[PDB]
Specification:
The PDB classes it as oxidoreductase. The chain is of the alpha+beta class. About 25% of the residues lie in helices and about 25% in strands. It binds N-oxalylglycine, magnesium ion (MG), nickel (II) ion and zinc ion.
Amino acid sequence: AQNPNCNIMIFHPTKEEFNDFDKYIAYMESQGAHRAGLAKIIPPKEWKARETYDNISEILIATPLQQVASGRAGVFTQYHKKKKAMTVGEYRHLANSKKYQTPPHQNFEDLERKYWKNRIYNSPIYGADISGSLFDENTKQWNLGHLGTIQDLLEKECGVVIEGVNTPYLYFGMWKTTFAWHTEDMDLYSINYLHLGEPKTWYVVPPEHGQRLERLARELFPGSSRGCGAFLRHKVALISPTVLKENGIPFNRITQEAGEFMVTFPYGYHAGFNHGFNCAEAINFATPRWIDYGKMASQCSCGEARVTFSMDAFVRILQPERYDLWKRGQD
Ligand SMILES: O=C(O)CNC(=O)C(=O)O
Ligand SMILES: [Mg+2]
Ligand code: NI
Ligand SMILES: [Zn+2]
């Protein structure tokens, strides 16, 4: 078995190997990358996502989200408070203000210590889930707006044509902006490209150990657990690496820098935080190996998780028994 300790693998494809996306994902998996739940892909030196980032300040963040925490330093939840619209230019200025900027620090490790110590006492503002793309239309390789669609993958594997579309999303982050512990909708893969700015630190639990994370989460968030059998779908719970180590949960950590891709694999729980002003682009995708995960994915039916139009058809075809109850939670 390849990668039996489930370590995060880092890949360095040649320009030749960067031509065929599907084939490279399949290569990574042949080397055991999926066991970790997350992989890093450094693009060939000749590759670029676009010529410059000089003209992005007029992008609108229609609903910036202030991330308000409750709980203790290592075990907390966050809620999102809606703020007034601002442009990317305005957001970058805010990120760099004395109130929100990254603090002095020695290295990534010191910054990580400071995040876990202090996150709960601040409320950073995140520009999340903005439909759109920063890839140049002439970038032919690993262009997240030109991937094969999940709907076409399900059609090719299962023979059923379904409605729905699949487009990327932009994330504008600042110091301490946080992504809570989750897997993707329908336990899909995701791919994330850090276009610019400061890094993003990731934590991941191997897919083979996801249920251990879920059990710990039920113990640490006992009211949430009673309210919904899949409350991590709400994307609000944070658990520190110290707490995970104390409870014997297997996980790994890695820092992503500007110009690098991360891939999350089906049922790989992940969480993390941004180091300072940055812009990431991400999209879900599928492969033939995903189908069985899709069929088994948990769902939130309490009504909190509230998801896209396109997830309907996935639930309808892959999880017909669940479909009825899950749509009640959607409506
Ligand atoms: O970048 C973020 O805030 C969160 N991204 C993801 O969870 C992802 O790409 O799967
Ligand atoms: Mg602009
Ligand atoms: Ni994710
Ligand atoms: Zn729920």
